Write a protein that binds this ligand. Sequence first.
Ligand SMILES: CO[C@H]1C[C@@H]2CC[C@@H](C)[C@@](O)(O2)C(=O)C(=O)N2CCCC[C@H]2C(=O)O[C@H]([C@H](C)C[C@@H]2CC[C@@H](O)[C@H](OC)C2)CC(=O)[C@H](C)/C=C(\C)[C@@H](O)[C@@H](OC)C(=O)[C@H](C)C[C@H](C)/C=C/C=C/C=C/1C
Length: 137
Amino acid sequence: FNKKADENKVKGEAFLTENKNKPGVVVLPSGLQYKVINSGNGVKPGKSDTVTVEYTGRLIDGTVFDSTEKTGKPATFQVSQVIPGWTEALQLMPAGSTWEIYVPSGLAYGPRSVGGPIGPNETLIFKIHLISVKKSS
Ligand SMILES: CO[C@H]1C[C@@H]2CC[C@@H](C)[C@@](O)(O2)C(=O)C(=O)N2CCCC[C@H]2C(=O)O[C@H]([C@H](C)C[C@@H]2CC[C@@H](O)[C@H](OC)C2)CC(=O)[C@H](C)/C=C(\C)[C@@H](O)[C@@H](OC)C(=O)[C@H](C)C[C@H](C)/C=C/C=C/C=C/1C
């Protein structure tokens, strides 16, 4: 079944390679890429602050394994408990601004199939809309 690993691997290596190149996308040294769907330039949380957002998660191949923005109902996460990719992105995503981040498998759910449809060597992407921001102290 590792055969699939190669697909996730190639599509994924191509996904990041392609995504960083895709317009609106900004790539970082960590390999994390974010695209600003809507600029808000508002507030936003630190690694320890809490955030409120809505989002849709899918595979490089379009296999949607999770969603929330579809519902449009925000979810609360602590930047410290969120996926690594998300960890930095929220801190860079201003409130009111809607971004899309493409998280390298290393910064996402792992290089292994760590999920349902999420197969071996899967790169995951999510759409992140910032509705409200908290604060640790
Ligand atoms: C894992 O299983 C997932 C289930 C699915 C997997 C697929 C993804 C699409 C999703 O649907 O969650 C999903 O919505 C999701 O993961 N999201 C939503 C979008 C941003 C945050 C991200 C995510 O889960 O970040 C976080 C990320 C998944 C956790 C790990 C971060 C490090 C990274 O290396 C790991 O890779 C695997 C994943 C989890 C969160 O959503 C937010 C921030 C964290 C919580 C609310 C905390 O409750 C959680 O923090 C971990 C905790 O473990 C606390 C302490 C204790 C409680 C009882 C346990 C919660 C467990 C949550 C587990 C979750 C949701």
